[PDB]
Each structure stands twice: as C-alpha cells, then as structure tokens.
Design an enzyme around this catalytic site. Sequence first.
Site, short mmCIF file in Angstrom:
data_model
loop_
_atom_site.label_atom_id
_atom_site.label_comp_id
_atom_site.label_asym_id
_atom_site.label_seq_id
_atom_site.Cartn_x
_atom_site.Cartn_y
_atom_site.Cartn_z
N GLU A 208 7.32 -0.95 13.94
CA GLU A 208 6.86 -1.42 12.65
C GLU A 208 7.76 -0.92 11.55
OE1 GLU A 208 2.83 -0.23 11.86
OE2 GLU A 208 2.82 -1.07 9.81
N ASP A 210 7.58 -0.92 7.58
CA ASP A 210 6.77 -1.23 6.41
C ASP A 210 7.65 -1.31 5.19
OD1 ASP A 210 4.41 -1.27 7.85
OD2 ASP A 210 4.26 0.91 7.73
N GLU A 213 4.12 -1.07 1.36
CA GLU A 213 2.71 -0.65 1.38
C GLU A 213 2.44 -0.29 -0.10
OE1 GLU A 213 0.68 -0.34 4.34
OE2 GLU A 213 2.39 -0.99 5.58
N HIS A 224 8.49 3.03 11.29
CA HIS A 224 7.68 3.68 12.34
C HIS A 224 8.24 3.31 13.73
CE1 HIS A 224 3.77 4.44 10.02
NE2 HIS A 224 4.39 3.62 9.20
#
Length: 426
Positions: A208, A210, A213, A224
């Site tokens: 992942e 991101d 966010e 991640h």
Amino acid sequence: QQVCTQQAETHPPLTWQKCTASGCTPQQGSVVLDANWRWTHDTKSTTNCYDGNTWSSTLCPDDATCAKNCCLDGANYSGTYGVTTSGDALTLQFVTASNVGSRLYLMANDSTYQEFTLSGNEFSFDVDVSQLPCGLNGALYFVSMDADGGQSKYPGNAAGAKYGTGYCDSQCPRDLKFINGQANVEGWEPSSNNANTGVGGHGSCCSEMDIWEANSISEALTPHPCETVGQTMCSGDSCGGTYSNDRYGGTCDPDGCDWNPYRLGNTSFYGPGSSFALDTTKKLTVVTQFATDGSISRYYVQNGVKFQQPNAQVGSYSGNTINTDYCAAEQTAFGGTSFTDKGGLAQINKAFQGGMVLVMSLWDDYAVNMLWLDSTYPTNATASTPGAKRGSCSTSSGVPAQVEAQSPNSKVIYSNIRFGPIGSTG
Ligand SMILES: *[C@@H]1O[C@H](CO)[C@@H](O)[C@H](O)[C@H]1NC(C)=O
Ligand SMILES: *[C@@H]1O[C@H](CO)[C@@H](O)[C@H](O)[C@H]1NC(C)=O
Ligand SMILES: *[C@@H]1O[C@H](CO)[C@@H](O)[C@H](O)[C@H]1NC(C)=O
C-alpha cells in the site's frame, strides 16, 4: 461471489490524463464501488446473505458455499452512496441515508482495474478537503490489487473488478466479506461499535502506498511494505493489523513510514485559513513523484503558487523526501520498527515497480477516531512525546457516531488526475 442484477451496475465515468514530455491527453476512465458496500443476496431470491452485521446461516454455512450461493448486486451510486462524477471530478459524500462513506477504484474498462506503475513516474491530483473536519479522511492511495479482482486465481469469484472485488491493503483487513472467491462468514465476529461491520477469519494483505491520508487539519504521505508484494490471504491473528491480538505479527507493515508536515514540526504549513501555506478551505494540487529507487518527492500548488514539501530535521536526517534515511531517523526519533521490519523502502519499491490500483475513499475510523492522523496519538503519549501530535484536533474528536451526527454532509472532491513520467504532469 456471484453477480445479480436487481440493480444495473453502471460505473460512473471519470476522465484523467496521461502525460509525456510532449503533453497530457485525456483518458476515458470510470470508477467502481468496493464490493463490501454492496447488497449481498441469494442468487435465486432477494433473501440477504449479509444483513446488519451477521450472515445468513442457510446461504452461508461456510466460506466456499456462501460464495456459490450469494451474489453482489449493482449500486445506485448517487442515491445510495453519495458518489457522483462530472468530467474529471469525483465527489464522495460522507453520510447518505443509512450509508457511511465509500471506497472506489479507477477502472480501465468495465472488467479491469487500471494498473499504474509508479516507478519513475508521478501522480498529480487536485483535492477539496474544505468539508473534511476532524475525524474524517478523504484517502487517495494505491494498493497492489489484482487487475481482475482475483478472478483468474479464484473461480469462486464470478464478479471480479466489475463489482469491486479483490481489495487488499497493508492492514490485512479482516472486515472484508469476500476474499479469494470465498466469503468470510467462518470466524465472523460482529463489531461492538458498528451495526454494519464485523471481523472474519480471513484477511486480505498487499502493499500500500498512501499518497493522501487527509482532512482539513492534517495530511500524510505513507508507504507500507508487505513481505509478499501482491495480494495474499491471511488467517486470523496471523494477519496482524488493528483487528488482531498482534498488530505486528503479520506479514505487512500497518504503520508505514509517514510524512505528515504537522507531525514533523511545521504546524503552520497545512490548515484552515490564509495564514497556512496551504489553505485547506480552498482546493489544492498535490504532486507525488516516485524515483526508480523508491525515493518519494512531493510538491503542492495552490493559486498557482508551487510549495515544495517543507524540509524537516529528524535526528541526523534533514531533507524533504521519503527515503531509507528519513524512515530510519523517524523510527529512531518517534519509536517503532515496523516499516523496516517488513522490508522498508526496498520492499515497497517492488510494489512501485509492479502494477497498483488507484483507490479513492471517504471514511471515519471505528478503531481510534482518526487521532493517528489529526490529534495526539497513541493515547498513552502526551503532546511532549516526540511525534505524538499529528494535528490540532481534540483527543476527544472523531468518534464515528458523533461525526456522523454532526457532520453528515462532509464530502471530498478529487479531480484533475494526471499521471506520467516525473516532470510531465505540470
Ligand atoms: C480492459 O482494459 C485492460 C487494461 O488496460 C486491457 O488490457 C483490455 O484490453 C481491456 N479489455 C477490453 C475488453 O476492452
Ligand atoms: C512552515 O512551512 C512554510 C512553507 O515551507 C514556511 O513558510 C514556514 O517558515 C515553515 N515554518 C517552520 C517553523 O519551519
Ligand atoms: C502504548 O500504547 C500502545 C498501544 O497503542 C501499547 O502497545 C504500548 O505497549 C504502550 N506503551 C507503554 C509504555 O505502556
């Protein structure tokens, strides 16, 4: 899961652009709602396979049987879920009648997710976070999902990307109702604080990245890694992540190497008002660049003014890019080892070299009230503790039932998506 058509499935169109050194050209894309938000019912009737937060014993005696007997149906995007598009813009409403939030994937066509290779490329988008108060999160991010939602591997999945199957992320989420062409009825425990969700025996893990966010108070950029780059199913507590008895005992990094300018000590960079460099009462452009070795760079544009990511000093590290040096310094200063334990930047770079799916979402946080993003966190820290304070929101903010009551018409608008080689989208 199977497919039913009590409601037709029509993916809202969304244009985005593909860019080169020569320019950008528009692409006719579309978005699809994640399968978890859909009605799951009997393939032969209108009897529910899932209602509230429990499963049908009759249709769903076990995970395989449930997937043979149960279908996903179409979505009334605007009417049920508060999802609309216009040209290059996607609007997600928070509360629409009984529905809360949404999660959408960008499609190449009716049957296939668009897959982006981040490596050596940059992604740009515009966003209006003005209507995202404390406790909300308009997240735009990439995950290493299968392009067909897993159909080629899992014959029990007859629905595929057309119905938003195959979600995975670095939390190894166990709240998904279908994983790997089976239901998640076995081991299912209803959530104590959410009438519509639960936690099953399986979860769905994958890398992942991101990009975004964020709400009007805080924003974070966070890779991640996972030990397996692409999608894998996990079982019970071996999943790790928030809904297990061992957050770090799984195969993914649920924490990430995050870059939140507020957390790093610049508390006047991004926020609501003209005194902030980026005024979150107004829309802005966010550009994220992925070097071939995984270094991530960032700049912003608002009112035609370009803002580089502010430089941060974290231990011996000074700079404004995510890289192994930053991520190691952050761990040292703020605590934790999760990101490097799970392979760190080299491992997430493998995901950047493969295909990832674009996710656009709006949600509140039924675990910890979004405090990790926009307040002081964890609760056994105080504001003095290095990196504890991530935004200016109250430590009592973001309770889902409270923000759903107070702020139902919160919304995020993502627009003007552009993708191409580094340097090409501006
Ligand atoms: C669907 O889009 C995928 C991804 O670009 C492409 O490979 C495939 O040719 C498309 N299929 C159809 C039937 O248009
Ligand atoms: C916050 O970031 C902005 C934009 O880079 C800058 O104007 C300001 O001086 C920064 N403040 C601190 C304390 O670093
Ligand atoms: C801090 O709280 C976390 C949960 O967020 C826990 O895992 C950790 O053990 C706590 N630290 C201390 C010193 O008690």
